[PDB]
Amino acid sequence: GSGMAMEDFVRQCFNPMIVELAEKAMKEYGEDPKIETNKFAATCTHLEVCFMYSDFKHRFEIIEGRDRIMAWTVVNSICNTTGVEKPKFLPDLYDYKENRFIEIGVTRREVHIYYLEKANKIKSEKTHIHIFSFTGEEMATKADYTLDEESRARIKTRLFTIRQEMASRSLWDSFRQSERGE
Ligand SMILES: O=C1c2c(O)c(=O)ccn2N([C@@H]2c3ccccc3SCc3c2ccc(F)c3F)[C@@H]2COCCN12
Ligand SMILES: [Mn+2]
Ligand SMILES: [Mn+2]
Structure with a gap:
């Protein structure tokens, strides 16, 4: 259940491309993945969900996984060619079929609680929100889940x-409790 154990878990259970992108994002925002090991795992998990979401004719542009400048460059380019308001x-994503940006949330807590937190933090009723739990639960803006049932099933399964895999290593309890502060 240790810090070293969690860092080892992350590097073993996530593909190297995900790990590298998560490390770069954490450094960009001033956090050390060797100290904030649960956050390291959270960023890898969320990035993987974004990539799995965008697989499932490229319907989706992936914003996540890019450095800050490139991320906003892509966002601005989309807004310039669609007239969608700049968020x-x-x-996390842009949906070219529905022509709307998407914010992906992954929570170790109840989805309704996290969904409210997300909706409150953005306040823009134009970004579509889609929350996943580690328990097979799901909540999205207007109960519009965007993807088909099979695609969401595989994300939930992963x-x-x-x-x-965390629980088998006694890492889940730590991971669960670090999402929200005291
Ligand atoms: O893109 C995100 C982001 C999300 O999209 C999200 O859903 C939750 C959280 N996020 N944050 C991610 C992040 C992503 C996934 C899981 C946990 C965290 S926790 C804060 C943090 C993030 C990235 C690097 C870092 F050092 C952080 F401390 C930051 C929020 O500022 C915009 C970029 N961003
Ligand atoms: Mn993001
Ligand atoms: Mn997100």
Whole structure:
């Protein structure tokens, strides 16, 4: 259940491309993945979900996984060619079919609680929110889940698998409790 154990878990259970992008994002925002090991795992998990979401004719542009400048450059380019309003906060994806940005949330807590937190932090009723748990639960803006049932099933399964792999190593309890502060 240690810090070293969690860092080792992350580097073993996530593909090297995900790990590298997560490390770069954490450094960009001033956090050390060797100290904030649960956050390291959280960023890898969330990045993987974004990449799995964008697979499932490229319907989706991935904003996440890019450095800050390139992320906003992509966002501005989309807004210039679609007239969609520029979001105040960086989103995770752009849906070319529905022509809307998407914010992806992954939570170790109840989805309704996290969904409210997300909706409150953005306040822009134009970014579509989609929350996943590690328990197979899901909540999205207007109960519009965007993807088909099978695509969401595989994301839920992968998240549950991560949870079980953590639990087998006694890492899940720590990971769960670090999402929200005291
Ligand atoms: O893109 C995100 C982001 C999300 O998209 C999200 O859903 C939750 C959280 N985020 N944050 C991610 C992040 C992403 C995934 C899981 C946990 C965290 S926790 C804060 C943090 C993030 C990235 C690097 C870092 F050092 C951080 F401390 C930051 C929020 O500022 C815009 C960029 N960003
Ligand atoms: Mn993001
Ligand atoms: Mn997100």
